[PDB]
Amino acid sequence: ARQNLKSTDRAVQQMLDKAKREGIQTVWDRYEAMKPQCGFGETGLCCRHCLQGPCRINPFGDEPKVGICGATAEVIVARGLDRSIAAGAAGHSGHAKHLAHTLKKAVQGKAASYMIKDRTKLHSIAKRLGIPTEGQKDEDIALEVAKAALADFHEKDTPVLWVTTVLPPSRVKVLSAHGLIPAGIDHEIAEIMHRTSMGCDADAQNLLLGGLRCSLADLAGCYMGTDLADILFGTPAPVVTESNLGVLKADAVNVAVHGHNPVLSDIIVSVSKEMENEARAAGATGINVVGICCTGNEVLMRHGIPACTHSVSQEMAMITGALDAMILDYQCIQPSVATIAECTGTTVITTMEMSKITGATHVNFAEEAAVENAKQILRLAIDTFKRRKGKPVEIPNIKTKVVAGFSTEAIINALSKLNANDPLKPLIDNVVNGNIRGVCLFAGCNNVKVPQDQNFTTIARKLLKQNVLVVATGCGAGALMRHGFMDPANVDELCGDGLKAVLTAIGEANGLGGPLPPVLHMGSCVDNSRAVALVAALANRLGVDLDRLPVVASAAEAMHEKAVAIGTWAVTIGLPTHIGVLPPITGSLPVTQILTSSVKDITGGYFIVELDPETAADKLLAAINERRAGLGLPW
Amino acid sequence: ARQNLKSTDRAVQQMLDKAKREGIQTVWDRYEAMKPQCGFGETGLCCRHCLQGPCRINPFGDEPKVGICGATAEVIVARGLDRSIAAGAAGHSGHAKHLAHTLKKAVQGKAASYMIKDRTKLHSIAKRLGIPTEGQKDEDIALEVAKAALADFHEKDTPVLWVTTVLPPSRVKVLSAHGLIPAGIDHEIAEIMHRTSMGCDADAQNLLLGGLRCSLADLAGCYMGTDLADILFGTPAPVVTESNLGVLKADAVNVAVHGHNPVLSDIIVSVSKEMENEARAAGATGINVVGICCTGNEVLMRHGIPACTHSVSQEMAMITGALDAMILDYQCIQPSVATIAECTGTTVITTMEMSKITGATHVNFAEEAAVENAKQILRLAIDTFKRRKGKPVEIPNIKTKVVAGFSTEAIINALSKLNANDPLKPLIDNVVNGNIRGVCLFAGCNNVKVPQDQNFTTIARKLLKQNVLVVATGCGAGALMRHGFMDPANVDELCGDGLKAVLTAIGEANGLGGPLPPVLHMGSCVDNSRAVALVAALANRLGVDLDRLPVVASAAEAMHEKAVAIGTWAVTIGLPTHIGVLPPITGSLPVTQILTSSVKDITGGYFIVELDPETAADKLLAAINERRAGLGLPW
């Protein structure tokens, strides 16, 4: 087996060879077993929205040409996509909702493991929302912020504040004019499910305008999730750590935190440190907590917990034979982990009521009991460590250095060292003079269809050479960090001369004796919202709307419904947005034309669907340069 | 073409022959063009929940055996079903939400076309909810009831009151114990979408318990919708009208009201009466408003508007060439109507923002402007009538007499004529003595897979002969009414001797000089909730829970996601529930076993999946008789 065709990560390749020796089936094996995949589903031309179905439409040829109810290709494709957006919105905003409840519990005195850690963030959010702070206790301001967050999930006398208060007013006005401002987060999710059900909305434009609106409900959930997590757990600032499977340690209790919401795993980090002497008792050096996927990102950003792996290669951490526990919340967890555990010895633990996996051990996490849960979980891990006394392990000796923690506040602080009272100005100055060509946000998943990380690294390398300021989140940040893009030692090799000068100037002003890393890690997938905050602050400072800025986004290897939602609100807020896998839209040319062209006329943004990464990088550069030309700037 | 293989309705058959002459494609033609349908989708063994897909699992044989992420057949089947329930819940509860807003507008003075028509219903709902009425104005009690309705869509300090206040406390306690009581209607819809998204819930039992909970959010939306529609438009009482295509009149302006929410179509009924002289001016006799689907049911129940047709045969009304307008809200409208209109001359009009159809004319209905909208719409219809001056039409001369309007209040009133102060007792007495064997609720759609009405009539005929009290809603009521089951003249032919004696005793006590009809029409699909109210009142009166009563349900020809949701809450509240088409569950034996067997242990109810209607009738009789035996009654 040529393992480079599966993953470009060498640690992953090493574990693919071990899995193949050992007979352990992987995601890649399960993909091969699926080929050829259904061409109706690939093109979007399948509907199962009622029990007359399943319906399909031939992309070309003869009948069937139309759904049994009369639904055209246009309708079928748009309804499918809409439901994917709604599903993504449900995940991000479910995460946010859970943190809103957690904050309320904290400040009501019902969960003393949680607290207001970032009081400055709390007060700033309150002021953005219009919540009064003067003469109020912190707990009462917090209570009010949690109330406001929960209120945005339903209809009320205002629209969703975690949209209307986070974008420029001019953007809010353009979106309002088209009826795109969500009325309530769960309200919009529900309306999508209604309108896409049989015999309801059957006009592609109408359907896709609803999808745009629902993508803003997803944005709101993202931003809410970042705001509340920062209050509770601290706003990230720059941190130095490591990534890839080599961060596992044979002589330690290796515990992965995996999923998205870090509400327990932020506690598992703090508790694990207390339980060092109990680990040594069991003959370990200590507990080694490592991250997978976005819960990993969260604790990497705030605590510098090393990232073990991401997305499509998550099973490989188990294949080492050194992963004593994998502690799961929700989202992006291949349920194969529960069966692979039988072979590898790993204790897989679920913790959220609505996210269980057959064959995994469940712990009923509650905030009020967060410490005692953590200790129970870590004591299963220590027991699992002891069970592999005298078992050889194969941990690839492969890791990278990672500098991360670039929240928007952190980036503004860093810039402030160059201009204390106008911190955005040094960035704008260098956009204007061409040292920075523009900004690209890498976001989203890996996808088994694409050799792991190949699109992120191929595109990022072309953009960096062309002096684009590259920011990343989620498993796009994961890809980039595991390939060295977060190590400032690689700035000379990766970055154009203009970008290098800027990264160096900022880093030297921040006392580093060198540069910021090539790529700025802005956090988890909800922390795509931090990129919004940065770009909206730029917009405000420039007195223009986001669809005039030289800012693009790339979901270069997208997988999840969440990633579809994020791509869609990136287009809705005015960004040219690349997707590097085919969404199920090609079976309708009119819907494709809306999403890739005529939506420009509505929001200013638009999808760029391009599976060849070299070609995608050129198209993203063209988009950036078109924005530069619109502002009258050289390019 | 043998048209009896498509529909058992002779009017439909006549219009199928006309469509075939004229070259007009129908739903049946589009079905034939779809065959053979995809066997993955038929069995549920297809997933498109991420961009790694589409995934499928062979029902039998060799690979693929598992989804690319590891998702088993069990998981894939349960997630698909869950999303169908959520979609149904979104439709019913979207309808309810819209009526909650309408009521608020009414009583705030913002829409003087709407008002509190049923003050007794208002006050009773307020008292059920715990809303105080003593010394309060009607408008303020209404405002409070609308507030409460909207509050049930989100989390709060109570659970969904339109569940917990409408079921027996013992049923609420059984459901609470299993964690099945919804926390908020849109909250549950969103949580379903989250938990079924990639990498989240992956345990069939956990997934299906969430589905049960979400089906109760659907119940809540149903019940809310019936409550609010009764306040605004009046609670139904017995009414005499007609059904089938013969209710169209060549010399009149024929206007169909079609969809579900009647918020404008209740106004179109009242306004149409005012516009008689304007119709005569255009050379019509007057405006003839007729119903299709559940908006038709709503205005049949309250106003005795004749029902033209239902569900799968809706296009046939157009094929007559006499349907001048079809006025659409949302749900269950084959979008083919917009194209068939080009051929037939019919003006198809949409009226709801989130439900448009390419090629239809849109009118932006607003409550504040309800009368002026109605007149605009009716004036398009009159213009269309004039355009078919001297055009032969083919209206099959085929209609039935329909007695309907059996709300729960109406049924209780009717019974009260036999026992004024214990109105349920005469019904219970006749269950106990075997005159009434049990109760069956027919519900749900027609489905092109099943020759139209064949399952409803075949099953109903066997049950009626066995003295079952048969109640119906939606297009199950439609089926039954078009085949004569709502004409009391057919009681001798259709009903067993015990049922006939009861229907006759009630009818004679109500001054009729004969019987109630064979089948009691309890209204639209949301008015399945009325059957819940009746069965819960019986439960309360008997001091037992619903899963001990001899009450079953049959969705004999189900189609819509809404129908899946209704079937699922019928099982959740404790009913043996027949479905006469295959839901996409057969690809997982463990999920099938849960839904058809082990769910009994949780809720007392269970699905009966049976495509042969004779066999289904025997299984439904067996279920009824098993309940009789449990109560110690002969059978």
Ligand code: SF4
């Ligand atoms: S909604 Fe229409 S296209 Fe979809 S499965 Fe049902 S009949 Fe087919």
Ligand code: SF4
């Ligand atoms: S969620 Fe799993 S089974 Fe479904 S499409 Fe994605 S990889 Fe396939």
Ligand code: FES
């Ligand atoms: S026909 Fe394959 S995705 Fe439905």
Ligand code: FES
């Ligand atoms: S493979 Fe046909 S429904 Fe997906």
Ligand SMILES: [C-]#N
């Ligand atoms: C990722 N959300």
Ligand SMILES: [C-]#N
């Ligand atoms: C039907 N609902």
Ligand SMILES: [Fe+2]
């Ligand atoms: Fe993520």
Ligand SMILES: [Fe+2]
């Ligand atoms: Fe209906």
